[PDB]
């Protein structure tokens, strides 16, 4: 079971297979999966409930398979695909803005996010 939730909307509060990107690389959870906490790395996420597959872009968060087999996914906001080239161009502008030093780090996260998005 999945319990994908945000302080914005409750997405997927059984959701058979969920594929997640975690700081442990990528983790997939299926039915009964062992109860873990994983910090979710900012992500391209696939959620499958039966055969149907839905494609979240997720702001990073926490994942917790609970021992009651509830995959509590908590993230600020998240499918990503409807949002989608000017964002890559302005992201190049933010990369040039990485010349300016926390602001560099912010802009770097922005560059990471563009790469992650651009893959889909």
């Amino acid at each position: 079971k999945l319990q994908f939730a945000l302080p914005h909307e409750t997405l997927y509060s059984e959701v058979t297979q969920v594929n997640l990107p975690a700081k442990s690389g990528r983790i997939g959870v299926l039915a009964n999966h062992v109860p873990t906490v994983e910090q979710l790395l900012p992500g391209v996420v696939e959620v499958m409930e039966g055969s149907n597959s839905k494609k979240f872009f997720i702001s990073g968060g926490f994942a917790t398979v609970q021992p009651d087999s509830q995959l509590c996914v908590t993230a600020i906001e998240a499918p990503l695909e409807s949002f989608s080239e000017n964002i890559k161009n302005l992201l190049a502008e933010a990369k040039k803005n990485v010349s300016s030093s926390r602001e560099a780090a912010e802009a770097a996260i922005q560059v990471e996010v563009l790469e992650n998005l651009q893959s889909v």
Binding site: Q3, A5, T10, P35, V37, F62, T64, Q66, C72
Partner: peptide, 19 residues
């Protein structure tokens, strides 16, 4: 409305803390 969405999300985190 806001308080619902937030609170639902929070409860999931609390689910961790309890267990």
């Amino acid at each position: 409305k806001a308080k619902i969405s937030a609170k639902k999300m929070d409860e999931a985190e609390q689910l961790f803390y309890k267990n």
